Amino acid sequence: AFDTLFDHAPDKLNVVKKTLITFVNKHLNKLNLEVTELETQFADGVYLVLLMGLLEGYFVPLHSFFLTPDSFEQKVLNVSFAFELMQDGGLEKPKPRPEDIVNCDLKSTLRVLYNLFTKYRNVE
Amino acid sequence: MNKHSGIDFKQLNFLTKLNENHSGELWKGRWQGNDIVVKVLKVRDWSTRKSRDFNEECPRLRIFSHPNVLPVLGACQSPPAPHPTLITHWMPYGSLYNVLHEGTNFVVDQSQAVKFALDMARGMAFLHTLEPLIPRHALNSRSVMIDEDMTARISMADVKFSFQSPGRMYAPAWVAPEALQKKPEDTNRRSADMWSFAVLLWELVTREVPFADLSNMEIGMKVALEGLRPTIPPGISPHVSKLMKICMNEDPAKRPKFDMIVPILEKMQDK
Ligand SMILES: COc1cc2ncnc(Nc3ccc(F)c(Cl)c3)c2cc1OCCCN1CCOCC1
Ligand SMILES: COc1cc2ncnc(Nc3ccc(F)c(Cl)c3)c2cc1OCCCN1CCOCC1
Numbered sequence: 001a002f003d004t005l006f007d008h009a010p011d012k013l014n015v016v017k018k019t020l021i022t023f024v025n026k027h028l029n030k031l032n033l034e035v036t037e038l039e040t041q042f043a044d045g046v047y048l049v050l051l052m053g054l055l056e057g058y059f060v061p062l063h064s065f066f067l068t069p070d071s072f073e074q075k076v077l078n079v080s081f082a083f084e085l086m087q088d089g090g091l092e093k094p095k096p097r098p099e100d101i102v103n104c105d106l107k108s109t110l111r112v113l114y115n116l117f118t119k120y121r122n123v124e
Numbered sequence: 125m126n127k128h129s130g131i132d133f134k135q136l137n138f139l140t141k142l143n144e145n146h147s148g149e150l151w152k153g154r155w156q157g158n159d160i161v162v163k164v165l166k167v168r169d170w171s172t173r174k175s176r177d178f179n180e181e182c183p184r185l186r187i188f189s190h191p192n193v194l195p196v197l198g199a200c201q202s203p204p205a206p207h208p209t210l211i212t213h214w215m216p217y218g219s220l221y222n223v224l225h226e227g228t229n230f231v232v233d234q235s236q237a238v239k240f241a242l243d244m245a246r247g248m249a250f251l252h253t254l255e256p257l258i259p260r261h262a263l264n265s266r267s268v269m270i271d272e273d274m275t276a277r278i279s280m281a282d283v284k285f286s287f288q289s290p291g292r293m294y295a296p297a298w299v300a301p302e303a304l305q306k307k308p309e310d311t312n313r314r315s316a317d318m319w320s321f322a323v324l325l326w327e328l329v330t331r332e333v334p335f336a337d338l339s340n341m342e343i344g345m346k347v348a349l350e351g352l353r354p355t356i357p358p359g360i361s362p363h364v365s366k367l368m369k370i371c372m373n374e375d376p377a378k379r380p381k382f383d384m385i386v387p388i389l390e391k392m393q394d395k
Contacts, residue, residue, distance in 0.1 A: 030339065030341070030342050031341070031342065031345055050341065050345075053292075053340065053341040053344075054339060054341045056146075056292075057294070057339065057340055057341075058292040058293055058294050058340050058341065059293040059294075059296040059304070059340045059341050059343060059344025059345065060291055060292065060293070060341075060344070061290065061291065061293055061303075061304055061305070061344070062304065062305045062348060063305065063306055063307045063310075064290060064291040065291070081291065084289075084291075085289075085291065085292070087168065088146075088168060088289060088292065089146075
């Protein structure tokens, strides 16, 4: 379904990417964080964790994840934890493996972000 | 046989729903002649392990020995109950947060505020004499209840159980900076509670919600990493200013114990 928005409407795909860009900045700019590139800036799991707290109304204690991950393994653990926060919030288990996000798979990244956008687009 | 059967869920009379949120549902009800509140907990991936843990953690909350501590009256084990459930007495004025910030009929005066502070300090001093809890306790104005005679009581039902996600913090404005950043086992948990009391003092002085203009994520990140602190209120007595500053010491080891500030607050009472 989303895969058709991805592959066989590449100017719709670019339209979705700018929508997701505007959505994540609405929230992350509150922490003085700016997103300009969806292909890489969610790969280490940090902004996904911060975004979930901004969207669902909680702080994530810094001992619960790796704010500055120093290995592929810590980035995978961050993304897995963000996936757990997503399920806590009512989303079904995300389809991509956490390593797919860390590896900057654009489709996996956009699928996860799009499901957040579908759910939380009206949060202020 | 088990040492506790807990409260029989079938004996609960559910009267009216009070609230529902991420953590579960609150109901006003009745049980064995008591006016009660029931919390039905929402838990993802409930398991026998988590149920065993709930049943081991609840007995410690049944504290009947201090006027400024509100006990859990009991808990419903699940199974056989549909969901893990907590019961406490109905407190007619609700939480301290409700009384200070959502009070449409009266504004509590500062003599009552100083009495609330003394009540909370006495209850915390007593709790701090007990062996540590497995559930995480957090002192804030939502976890203090105001009884029918206006006595403030620490609510034992508001602990966070081992199966409730430690990764989601919903009232960070009251949490000590070190507790935003370090695992509980790496902090002095009793000194962290003094910071929370300092923020309660600030709330009693200003009658404002701390960091009301910020989201919980913004609060935790700015307090932990950018040194955000409550602004010391203008035009208060030097004595109150001094007490609030010592309770909010950046160094956890230099904060007073609750049993040290109880006599200070006693001398500040009107009667
Ligand atoms: C007088 O009202 C309450 C008394 C309460 N007395 C004791 N405990 C309460 N809450 C509580 C909190 C956690 C628990 F696990 C349990 Cl068992 C109970 C209480 C919650 C109470 O009210 C909760 C709903 C507060 N409303 C919600 C709607 O907007 C206005 C304030
Ligand atoms: C290191 O000693 C404590 C740590 C604690 N850490 C966290 N919480 C404590 N108590 C506590 C705090 C809040 C509560 F709601 C309840 Cl029920 C109990 C603690 C009580 C503690 O000590 C209680 C006094 C008796 N112990 C016994 C042995 O060594 C230390 C002193």
